[PDB]
Design a protein around this ligand. Structure first.
Ligand SMILES: CCCCCCCCCCCCCCCCCC(=O)OC[C@H](COP(=O)([O-])OCC(O)COP(=O)([O-])OC[C@@H](COC(=O)CCCCCCCCCCCCCCCCC)OC(=O)CCCCCCCCCCCCCCCCC)OC(=O)CCCCCCCCCCCCCCCCC
Ligand SMILES: CCCCCCCCCCCCCCCCCC(=O)OC[C@H](COP(=O)([O-])OCC(O)COP(=O)([O-])OC[C@@H](COC(=O)CCCCCCCCCCCCCCCCC)OC(=O)CCCCCCCCCCCCCCCCC)OC(=O)CCCCCCCCCCCCCCCCC
Ligand SMILES: CCCCCCCCCCCCCCCCC[C@@H](O)O[C@H](CO[C@H](O)CCCCCCCCCCCCCCC)COP(=O)(O)OCC[N+](C)(C)C
Ligand SMILES: CCCCCCCC/C=C\CCCCCCCC(=O)OC[C@H](COP(=O)(O)OCCN)OC(=O)CCCCCCC/C=C\CCCCCCCC
Ligand SMILES: CCCCCCCC/C=C\CCCCCCCC(=O)OC[C@H](COP(=O)(O)OCCN)OC(=O)CCCCCCC/C=C\CCCCCCCC
Ligand SMILES: CCCCCCCC/C=C\CCCCCCCC(=O)OC[C@H](COP(=O)(O)OCCN)OC(=O)CCCCCCC/C=C\CCCCCCCC
Ligand SMILES: CCCCCCCC/C=C\CCCCCCCC(=O)O[C@H](COC(=O)CCCCCCC/C=C/CCCCCCCC)COP(=O)(O)OCCN
Lengths: 178, 156, 128, 459, 603
């Protein structure tokens, strides 16, 4: 989510992802805590018998057959956290997220209420106004010729500088705005 | 604010115009494949995998999080068919053929057994209920000017 | 020795079951790198156009306009009368019409015949 | 009838003599006053008709259409007030002149005691609409659209004129009263077949019939908001009014000449309802929904039963109101997005809640929710078709389902979901737009209290 | 004079006052939910009187107050029917709605738009009252569509969630599939009987043909979520828990069964429609119970329980016992609404968790909900002398002693056993084991609203069955004699279901793991019906909607035939005519040719 993706996933990453998926579906299968702990230790052991495999052409055949086994017993109704992309409350509060720029359209009668918040709002707007002009130059000078290769942005390197393209990340509405 | 060159064109039939079209849709040259040059006018537009947009990565920071879409990337021809609110081609735990066989076998077996049970009903070792007044002739239909044949019931 | 998963059109094949995500070659890695590079270029362009405080409008997406034009206003200029196209058009534009015409004509012929001969029990059929 | 025609004519000098910053107020106020005056025609009688003079007469089929036509103009003026702001005073006066001329032509067309005058005004309505479409249209395709909107119509109606004069050479008159009282059957002959075709194809093309509807998406998409209003609300009902007026002489030939048109309409309703499901444009979706509803009305007219006529009239009125409101909502969205694409603007109920409520009500009215007059016409036509044939319901039922689908689809894609992040020019809805929405929607819910006002002469 | 009609209309009209007040100042304060709850309670108290009058005398009435319109020989008027079913079902629905609103005042406290939620609930209640009290087919259709629209608006309560919108559209689609049959029935009734009024329909139909009853059965299957059109009810649980507790559990879903009950004079004259109804109910209840036995979401399991109960009531309709089906409606309302309320309390106390894999020891951690759910599950399984026994036991006795399909009887017995089994599953997996939730314990039931709302439904599910059964006149012949084994068949099968479900559930404690079988995969995936039927048809339709209708026909061939061919022909003719080099040689050669041809041709 917050981290930029890479061009490809290494064997280590695929092994870790398979291990996590297997553990999650095992705890979905093994409802109780003691049974899950026993079978998770057993599956970690059976996953550990081939840690020190040296040749890559044989270690890729082990994970390839492990992905054929996981699919067969993958518990077609797994446990999903409520806020996860499959959970029951995934995007429940997504309609309560109102953008900050909407406050620019408030009537002056409504802006009479909450004066300190709006004063801080022009303060933030001015800060962004100078920061963006700095960041355009910083990102233009730091980019390699021909365009970026990965969508990872550099931080701020001077004293008064701010990280390039920061306005829409720090001004997230909230997790539960209302 | 879009140039004439940018818009879709005829089917790319030569390698140079194929490369130009691939560059136009913001994709790799060997990753670009147009629809077959049949009568239907797909033309210049590229053919993307028929994968649904429900199965796209839900953790990548898409520019359109609801649609799981990115700014600039070529949109699938049938995007409106695959919008997470419609048909999705996400892989299932059980193969499609096996699910189809199981579903239709269950339905056919249920229908056949219902028909069989209709052939062989279930009842009680009793005779029909007896109603006194000429099988309730007056209270069921009426017509009191015909005097139907009387029916008497056998007391046992 | 487990049963094998058979992909279908409406139930595709999982990424972890792809037999092409293992037999990796340097050409495949180069292709992935180029894909990431162009994706990052597009993302950088969008983010530069998105965080600008001087922008007070909609960020025009060439891909969206191109998709709409391809779906709407480009179908005819690339149309060519072919046996497949001709047969499909004739079927989908003629067959249903004659099918429904035959069905309704048969039903109404039966109804009119039953009116003429006289056993239809039209009692209480006042409002038509 | 002159007490309404004369003020419509006097609307032109008042507009042309008004100040450069006061034309809209005068036009709106006097149009509303004219509509209030025209409300008097709604007092119809079970007897023959309101025969004002030798030239003009009013019936309970003409009265609701006249009231709707008079009521439409203020809504069109309010809708066009926005996008004509940077327009010069002379060109704004020309636009208002075109609208007033179109209303005058429609008002004279809906009374039209004589058939040749009816045809002349029927074609006179074509000029201001063409000028509006081709002149004040944003996109480059408008000209082509205008061409289509012209030629199709004329291609339909040029034979009709000949047929009309031919009738006056045999019957001797074209007055609708004399035509109705001196009606004689048409024998089964090739000449009578071609006379039937000439009389019917003129009004089939403008309704439009499936297969002749290609001009309608172009004309509605490319026209300005007022043009879309007048085309969807009133200009589509000219074909239905003409067919209900002219089918008095086509019997009993229609009993077997309506089969191709009944089949075409009953399949085209399904085809257009399915087309609405996959559309990248809001205006095209609304236009195809209009095509479906008009195909249902065509089916009703071809059945030729009292319930068919009642349902056809009610459906025409309700569809005109609903399509006008939907086009207004689409234009309100477009004026902020400037793209006219369904999926670019999303999650609008978070930003514009009252507009979301208006969208919900318009979608429900299009969805034919009881006890709206939309469903009154729907059920009347459905029962009449069931009496005509017990199988038609199947098709009808499918249409109903599909209708609801795309309606809610139009409601869900545009209003529900997450808002588009890079669109920050969504200003709060003005009082003008909300007033326009209310003036569109309240008459529907008030007419559902007194349905007999729009059920036609066969009530 | 005549207090019966006045009170019956007054309860309905006072159900409407908060809707009018929704534009006033009270709607902008926090007193609106309490205002609506008090209005509903007062309406229930007022409507308790017509029930007493009917119970004492047997008062029946129809009120035709406002004449809507006269279409030649057919008069449509605002007619209300106040027969046994209406005056009996108004108080039950009002009491359930009052309990659900008092529960919602506590459950939905964090919702910014809570007044809109309450007004939506009241609008649904008004639409259901219109549906129930309708005397003509048009008003019945108005209520039929109003309940569907309210369900659509309440399912997609959270507009941000895509799944909620998908579920709402699915519910609308299935309800419109039912609406097709409803419209068929209305059209046939008006074409043949020349009236949408129930009185004229009953008089003019001594033997009802197949078509109108098939249409009514199709509409009832569409809204009651029978096996053909079932998945929308399980999918409708994306909405808030009170919506599922009120709409999709006890009130809106029984509308199809109520429609079939309203036409019982016409159902007894047809024997094939009864067989179809019996088969549909049996397959529905069996399939839904089999799906429920293996689910892990509590709300989904309770939804499948509701669907199974609806299938059982449809079986009862199919065996020609409408009054018994209405009685089962009345008892199911109470205990299933209370079951959903307990589930919602568990979910709220457990930080918005619905899966039972993260529910552990709640028998002692939160006892009031535990005992309420135990009572509700005992009532559901037809434990003797509870609200569910007095209906379900009679259902079983009637279906055993009827000349009906034997397969349907077997399916009903297996469905009852499976009902006992998944009730055991709920209790075992939600209240018996060790805790499995996150360590931050926030269990709390100490709120007067929740306690009072649950306790009223407890009193209902304990005593209302007895009160109703002993306080209504007899409307069917009793099964006085009974084989001893046949008398206890329901109890035996329910106890066997308890025993087998508990024995199979206790094996999860063992330290043994095994991959699932084919039957488990079939039952857990809802019989594969939601997958295939939501991917094979729709895609194809959508594909056609762009392939044949949109592109091939509208955009290509219909464009090629009339306009483009004309343009091509005119362009070619213009090119041929205007392609003159300007040579007078050719001009006068043509002049000579035409002069020569005219003399020969025209003389
Ligand atoms: C149940 C009867 C109630 C009678 C009481 C009086 C009600 C008068 C209503 C008149 C029409 C309403 C005006 C339309 C636009 C609303 C204006 C607005 O901006 O709202 C903001 C306003 C203030 O809220 P806000 O916070 O400031 O605004 C924030 C957003 O707007 C956020 O807005 P929101 O989230 O609050 O939603 C807006 C709301 C309001 O928007 C609407 O959609 C309302 C319109 C619904 C109709 C949809 C079209 C279908 C055709 C039905 C035609 C019925 C008309 C009958 C004659 C009416 C005469 C004008 O939408 C709904 O509530 C959902 C409506 C779906 C109901 C479906 C059931 C329809 C059939 C029911 C039976 C009807 C005949 C009964 C015959 C038998 C019994 C005698 O809220 C309201 O005023 C709501 C009014 C109450 C809703 C009425 C819904 C049912 C009543 C229909 C007519 C009554 C029938 C007569 C029988 C009486 C006995
Ligand atoms: C007249 C005398 C009266 C007395 C009569 C005799 C008295 C009773 C005799 C007993 C009879 C059977 C009792 C055994 C009950 C079953 C328990 C069991 O073994 O399940 C475990 C076992 C699988 O366990 P697992 O996968 O290892 O566990 C997964 C984990 O543990 C994860 O597990 P979990 O923790 O997630 O949840 C566990 C859950 C999940 O377990 C499941 O996987 C669900 C599957 C089990 C439900 C089957 C029960 C009823 C089946 C009705 C089927 C109707 C026809 C279907 C048509 C199919 C069409 C192909 O299981 C349960 O909760 C309990 C299961 C149900 C037991 C409670 C009710 C059953 C007792 C009453 C039944 C009959 C007596 C009625 C009395 C009427 C008077 C005569 O299930 C089976 O092996 C299936 C056995 C029966 C299936 C029948 C359908 C076979 C159809 C195949 C095709 C045949 C040819 C068709 C050709 C058609 C061509 C057109
Ligand atoms: C494209 C978008 C829609 C536009 C409108 C489409 C609808 C137009 C169709 C017009 C109605 C049908 C045309 C002819 C109807 C006559 C009745 C005929 O169908 O029945 C048979 C007639 O058989 C044949 O149709 C005879 C004519 C055959 C030649 C006509 C060409 C048919 C195909 C042409 C298709 C071209 C369509 C596009 C035109 C531009 C029965 O034969 P019979 O009972 O003995 O004689 C009946 C006539 N009598 C009684 C006066 C003597
Ligand atoms: C007759 C119906 C013909 C088929 C109708 C086609 C409609 C196409 C357009 C539908 C719009 C697309 C859509 O709704 O999205 C698909 C959406 C997604 O599925 P979910 O399970 O919600 O996924 C959530 C998890 N991610 O699914 C749906 O809602 C569509 C379901 C359509 C069902 C069509 C099949 C119905 C068959 C009816 C048979 C029963 C006949 C009568 C039975 C007995 C009655 C007496
Ligand atoms: C509260 C305001 C009133 C204050 C005190 C007054 C109390 C009542 C005294 C007023 C005088 C009596 C009165 O209302 O007059 C009756 C008067 C009409 O007079 P009639 O001519 O007898 O009926 C028309 C047919 N000829 O009735 C009314 O209009 C009022 C009651 C109407 C019923 C309510 C309608 C609500 C539903 C709206 C329509 C919905 C669609 C139609 C229903 C479809 C059903 C198929
Ligand atoms: C016997 C003869 C019958 C004559 C029937 C007359 C039909 C009326 C339309 C005539 C238009 C023909 C001219 C034409 O289309 O030219 C092709 C033209 C070339 O573009 P230009 O603008 O001329 O030049 C720009 C580039 N330099 O192509 C177009 O743009 C076509 C756009 C307009 C489409 C009009 C559609 C008209 C057809 C619809 C139905 C009318 C048919 C009437 C007869 C019906 C048959 C009984
Ligand atoms: C959007 C495109 C639509 C184009 C119009 C489609 C309808 C065209 C129908 C024909 C048009 C002219 C019909 C004539 C008007 C009626 C007059 C009449 O009926 O008099 C007949 C004359 O009948 C005719 O002359 C008809 C001949 C037709 C000539 C024009 C042919 C046009 C194309 C014909 C095929 C099209 C039909 C289907 C069109 C489908 C829609 C495109 C009898 O003449 P008498 O000599 O007095 O009596 C004989 C006994 N003494």
């Amino acid at each position: 989510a917050f981290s930029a993706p890479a061009a490809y996933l290494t064997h280590q990453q695929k092994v870790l992802r398979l291990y996590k998926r297997a553990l999650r579906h095992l705890e979905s299968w093994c409802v109780h805590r003691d049974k899950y702990r026993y079978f998770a230790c057993l599956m970690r052991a059976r996953f550990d018998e081939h840690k020190n495999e040296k040749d890559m052409v044989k270690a890729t055949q082990l994970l390839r057959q492990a992905e054929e086994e996981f699919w067969y017993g993958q518990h077609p109704q797994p446990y999903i956290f409520p806020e996860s992309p499959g959970g029951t409350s995934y995007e429940r509060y997504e309609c309560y997220k109102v953008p900050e720029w909407c406050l620019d359209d408030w009537h002056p009668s409504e802006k009479a209420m909450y004066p300190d918040y709006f004063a801080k709002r022009e303060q933030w707007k001015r800060l962004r106004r100078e920061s963006w002009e700095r960041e355009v130059k910083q990102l233009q000078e730091e980019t390699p010729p021909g365009g970026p290769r990965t969508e990872a942005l550099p931080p701020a390197r001077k004293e008064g500088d701010l990280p390039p393209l920061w306005w829409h990340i720090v001004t997230r509405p909230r997790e539960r705005p209302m | 604010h879009v140039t004439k060159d940018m818009f879709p064109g005829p089917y790319p039939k030569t390698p140079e115009e194929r490369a130009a079209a691939a560059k136009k849709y913001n994709m790799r040259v060997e990753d670009y494949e147009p629809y077959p040059d049949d009568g239907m006018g797909y033309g210049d537009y590229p053919k993307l995998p028929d994968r649904s947009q429900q199965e796209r990565d839900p953790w990548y920071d898409w520019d359109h999080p609801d649609l799981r879409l990115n700014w600039g990337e070529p949109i699938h021809w049938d995007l409106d068919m695959y919008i997470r609110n419609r048909v999705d081609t996400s892989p299932t735990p059980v193969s499609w053929n096996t699910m189809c066989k199981h579903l239709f076998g269950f339905v056919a077996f249920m229908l056949f057994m219902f028909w069989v049970g209709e052939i062989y009903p279930s009842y009680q070792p009793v005779g029909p209920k007896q109603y006194p007044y000429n099988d309730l002739y007056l209270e069921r239909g009426g017509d009191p000017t015909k005097e139907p044949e009387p029916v008497v019931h056998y007391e046992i | 020795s487990f049963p094998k998963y058979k992909p279908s059109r409406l139930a595709t094949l999982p990424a972890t079951l792809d037999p092409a995500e293992y037999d990796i070659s340097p050409e495949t890695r180069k292709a992935q790198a180029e894909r990431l590079a162009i994706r990052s270029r597009l993302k950088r362009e969008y983010l530069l156009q998105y965080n600008d405080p001087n922008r007070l409008g909609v960020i025009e997406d060439p891909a969206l306009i191109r998709w709409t034009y391809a779906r709407s206003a480009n179908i005819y200029p690339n149309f060519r009368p072919t046996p497949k196209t001709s047969l499909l058009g004739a079927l989908f534009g003629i067959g249903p019409l004659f099918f429904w015409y035959y069905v309704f004509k048969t039903d109404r012929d039966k109804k009119e015949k039953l009116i003429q001969e006289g056993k239809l029990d039209q009692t209480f059929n006042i409002s038509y | 009838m002159l007490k309404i025609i004369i003020p419509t004519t006097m609307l032109l000098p008042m507009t042309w003599m008004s100040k450069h910053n006061m034309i809209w107020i005068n036009a709106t106020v006097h149009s509303l006053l004219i509509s209030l005056i025209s409300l008097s025609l709604l007092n119809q009688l079970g007897e023959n008709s309101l025969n004002f003079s030798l030239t003009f007469f009013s019936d309970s089929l003409s009265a609701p259409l006249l009231v709707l036509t008079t009521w439409l103009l203020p809504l069109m003026l309010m809708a066009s007030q926005s996008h004509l702001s940077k327009e010069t005073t002379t060109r704004k006066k020309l636009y208002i002149t075109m609208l007033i001329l179109l209303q005058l032509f429609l008002i004279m067309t809906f009374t039209a005691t004589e058939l040749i005058l009816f045809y002349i005004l029927f074609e006179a309505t074509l000029v201001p609409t063409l000028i509006i479409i081709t002149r004040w249209g944003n996109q480059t395709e408008r000209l082509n659209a205008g061409l289509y909107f012209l030629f199709y119509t004329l291609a339909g109606s040029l034979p009709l004129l000949v047929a009309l004069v031919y009738i006056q050479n045999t019957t001797g008159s074209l007055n609708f009263l004399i035509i109705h009282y001196w009606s004689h059957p048409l024998s089964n002959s090739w000449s009578n077949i071609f006379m039937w075709l000439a009389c019917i194809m003129a009004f089939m093309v403008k309704m439009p019939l499936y297969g002749l509807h290609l001009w309608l998406p172009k004309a509605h998409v490319e026209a300005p908001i007022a043009g879309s209003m007048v085309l969807a609300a009133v200009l589509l009902k000219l074909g239905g009014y003409g067919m209900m007026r002219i089918t008095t002489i086509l019997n009993p030939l229609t009993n077997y000449m309506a089969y191709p048109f009944l089949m075409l309409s009953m399949w085209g309703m399904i085809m257009t309802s399915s087309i609405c499901l996959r559309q990248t444009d809001l205006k095209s979706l609304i236009a195809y929904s209009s095509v479906s509803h008009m195909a249902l009305v065509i089916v009703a007219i071809m059945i030729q039963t009292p319930w068919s006529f009642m349902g056809a009239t009610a459906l025409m009125i309700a569809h005109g109101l609903t399509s006008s409101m939907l086009f207004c909502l689409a234009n309100t969205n477009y004026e902020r997005v400037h793209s006219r694409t369904m999926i670019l603007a999303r999650g609008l109920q978070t930003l514009l809640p009252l507009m979301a409520t208006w969208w919900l009500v318009a979608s429900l009215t299009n969805l034919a929710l009881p006890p709206s007059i939309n469903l009154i016409g729907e059920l009347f036509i459905i029962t009449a078709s069931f009496s005509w044939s017990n199988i038609t319901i199947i098709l009808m039922g499918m249409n109903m389902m599909i209708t609801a689908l795309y309606s809610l689809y139009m409601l869900i894609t545009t209003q529900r979901g997450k808002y588009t992040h890079h669109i920050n020019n969504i200003k709060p809805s003005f009082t003008r737009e909300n007033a326009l929405m209310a003036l569109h929607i309240l008459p529907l819910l008030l007419l559902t209290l007194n349905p007999k006002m729009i059920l036609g002469p066969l009530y | 004079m005549n207090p019966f009609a006045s009170l019956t209309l007054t309860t309905l009209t006072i159900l409407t006052i908060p809707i009018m007040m929704s534009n006033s100042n009270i709607y902008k304060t926090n007193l609106y939910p309490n205002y609506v709850k008090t209005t509903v309670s007062y309406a229930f108290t007022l409507s308790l009187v017509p029930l007493l009058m009917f119970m004492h005398t047997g008062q029946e009435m129809i009120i035709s107050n406002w004449h809507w319109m006269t279409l030649q020989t057919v008069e449509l008027s605002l007619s209300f029917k106040m027969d046994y079913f209406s005056v009996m079902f108004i108080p039950v629905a009002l009491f359930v709605t009052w309990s659900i609103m008092e529960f919602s005042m506590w459950y939905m406290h964090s919702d910014p738009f809570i007044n809109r939620f309450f007004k939506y609930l009241l609008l649904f209640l008004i639409t259901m009252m219109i549906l129930v009290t309708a005397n003509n087919l048009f008003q019945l259709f108005i209520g039929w569509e109003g309940v569907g629209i309210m369900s659509f608006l309440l399912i997609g309560w959270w507009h941000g969630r895509t799944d909620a919108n998908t579920a709402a559209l699915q519910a609308i689609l299935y309800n419109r599939i039912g609406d097709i049959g409803f419209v068929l029935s209305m059209a046939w009734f008006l074409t043949h009987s020349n009236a949408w009024d129930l009185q004229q329909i009953f008089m003019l139909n001594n033997e009802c043909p197949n078509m109108p009853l098939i249409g009514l059965l199709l509409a009832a299957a569409g809204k009651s979520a029978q096996f053909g059109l079932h998945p929308w009810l399980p999918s409708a649980m994306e909405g808030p828990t009170p919506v599922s507790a009120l709409l999709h559990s006890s009130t809106m879903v029984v509308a199809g069964v109520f429609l079939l009950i309203r036409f019982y004079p016409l159902m007894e004259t047809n024997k094939l429609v009864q067989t179809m109804t019996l088969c549909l109910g049996a397959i529905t209840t069996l399939f839904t119970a089999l799906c429920a036995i293996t689910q892990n979401d509590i709300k989904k399991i309770v939804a499948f329980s509701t669907s199974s109960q609806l299938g059982l009531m449809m079986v009862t309709i199919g065996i020609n016992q409408p009054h018994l089906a209405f009685l089962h409606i009345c008892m199911h309302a109470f205990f299933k609404a209370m079951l959903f309320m307990c589930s919602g309390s568990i979910i709220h106390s457990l930080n918005d968790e619905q899966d039972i894999r993260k529910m552990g020891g709640l028998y002692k951690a939160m006892p009031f909900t535990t005992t309420a759910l135990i009572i509700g599950s005992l009532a559901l399984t037809g434990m003797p002398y509870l609200t569910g026994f007095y209906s379900k036991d009679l259902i079983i006795e009637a279906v055993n002693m009827s000349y009906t399909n034997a397969w349907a009887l077997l399916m009903t017995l297996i469905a009852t056993s499976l009902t006992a089994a998944y009730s055991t599953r709920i209790i075992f997996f939600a209240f018996l084991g060790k805790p499995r939730f996150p360590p931050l314990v926030l269990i709390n039931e100490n709120n007067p609203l929740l306690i009072n709302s649950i306790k009223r439904l407890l009193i209902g599910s304990i005593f209302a069955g007895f009160i109703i059964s002993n306080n209504i006149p007899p409307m069917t012949v009793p099964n006085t004699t009974m084989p001893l084994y046949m008398k206890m068949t329901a109890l035996i099968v329910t106890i066997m279901g308890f025993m087998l479900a508990l024995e199979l559930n206790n094996t999860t404690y063992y330290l043994k793991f095994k991959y699932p079988s084919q039957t488990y995969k079939f039952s857990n995936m809802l019989g594969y019906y939601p997958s295939i039927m939501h991917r094979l048809p729709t895609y194809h339709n959508l594909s056609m909607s762009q392939k044949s209708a949109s592109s091939l026909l509208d955009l290509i061939w219909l464009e090629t035939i009339l306009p483009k061919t004309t343009s091509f022909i005119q362009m070619k003719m213009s090119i041929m005519v205007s392609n003159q080099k300007g040579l007078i040689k050719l001009y006068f050669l043509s002049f000579l040719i035409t002069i020569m041809i005219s003399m020969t041709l025209f003389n």
